[model samples]
Target chain A: SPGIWQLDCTHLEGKVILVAVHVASGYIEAEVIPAETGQETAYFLLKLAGRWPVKTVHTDNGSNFTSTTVKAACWWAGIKQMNKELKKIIGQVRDQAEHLKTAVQMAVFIHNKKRKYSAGERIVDIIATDI
Target chain B: SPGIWQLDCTHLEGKVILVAVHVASGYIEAEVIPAETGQETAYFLLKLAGRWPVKTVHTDNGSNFTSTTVKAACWWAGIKQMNKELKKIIGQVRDQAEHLKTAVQMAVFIHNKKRKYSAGERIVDIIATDI
Candidate 1:
């Protein structure tokens, strides 16, 4: 399946921090930041590389992402960075918020049902045997 | 303030209905629909105009809102119809979903504070005289 990874900053305890998420696995990674500078984002990329293998990254054309430091890091890491255009659109805000909680429940339901992603392969059947 | 309005179709009692909200005033109006047809929107607007005078109207470029029926109605009524373009943007989705419940409490706080809108006229002060 095709997926993308992104990092967004949130304020916590008087400090800015990066929160990275992998769309496929839904894995979340976080790191604290002293400031929103290119150097900080470069360090974040280095730390992220140690934990996850990333081939491509997609981000909005923000200063931090477009900085020389980040560009060099991606070049050295042999990773391709893509920029997505920003636009305003009507979205299912209520549904998206509710979907987060429901997603976990639905995942569990599918796990119990032994749903198969491919022919002759149940997720539960695979997990039980693999474990 | 620049504003946009949207007509969301909701299923109720085995029927589709249009719920229109004026973004600026937060005022909402509803109309029943037997089907999602342009003619239905035309009839609804005719009835709507009989109830209230509209100078300008904004709506999403949905089929019903953009149809010939609605366009003709706007021309005949001399109402300026504004079509809002759609785009996607990140927002505090979780915070917004919670804010709806919190808004009622905040409304009372603002009402008590006698917040002035125009130069010297407070909302409470104006309401007191009018009532």
Candidate 2:
């Protein structure tokens, strides 16, 4: 519940290579498999859960996610698979490319300062509280 | 008897560093000395003759060659000092510079070609025939 989970398939061996990402921590885990079919997707999900316990899963409306095999796997694990809200933030970035170019240096300076934790509330502090 | 000889003194330490070049083979021998004075020039010419039996000696019309001591050495060795005529020929050919470049290339080519030779005339025969 504290972290967002996302799943996508990358191409490898002329087929799909399944990958899972932890959005908040930018942690990634991946597997190269024959296809993105329901059986293959379910197998990867089970393996992922066995390694790291998950409270919830998020996925797109792909056929593999809607399949009976995948639903059964999620049911067995007592995990709820939720649909993700598609956002056009990346599209907005391309639209404002000219403005962003002018403010690149200043934007980077401010963003990095906010993103990195201050001395009093450091990265170690966040990791300690979350994990 | 057919080999060529040449003399040049390069500047070093605000003085001349005498050098003798074997023209046909582009082989060079040098001496770093204090000055190109008459006594020193004569001493080097005597030393050079002791090492190699020079058939002909060529030099530029520098004061070192025109000096009395150098003339005495040439007379003693019975080695003809063909200065003006030979220098003119050498200037035209720029033979020293060309030979230096060609000699290195020729050595590498010959080394590789001989490595591949079989049932051929020996290296000594080829060199003697000027092949």
Residue A31 of model 2, lDDT score: 45
**lDDT tens readout by residue for model 2, B62-102:** 55678876787666555677223223333443442233222
Name the runs in model 1 displaced over 4 angstroms: A1-3, A82-131, B1-131
Q: In terms of TM-score, which candidate is strongest? A: 2
First chain of candidate 1, TM-score? 0.56
Model 2 misplaced stretches (Cα beyond 4 Å): A82-131, B1-131
lDDT of each: 0.42, 0.47
DockQ of each: 0.01, 0.01
Model 2 agreement with the true structure over A1-101: per-residue lDDT tens digits: 43346788755226454656554543344444566688767766654443333557776646568888688667754567601211122123334333322
Candidate 2's clash total is 0
Model 2 / residue A77 / CA error / Å: 1.1
Q: Which number leads on lDDT?
A: 2
Please, what are the lDDT tens digits per residue for candidate 1 over residues B1-131? 22234456654345565655445433344444556777666555543442233446655545557787668656654557611111011022223223221222222222222223321122212222322
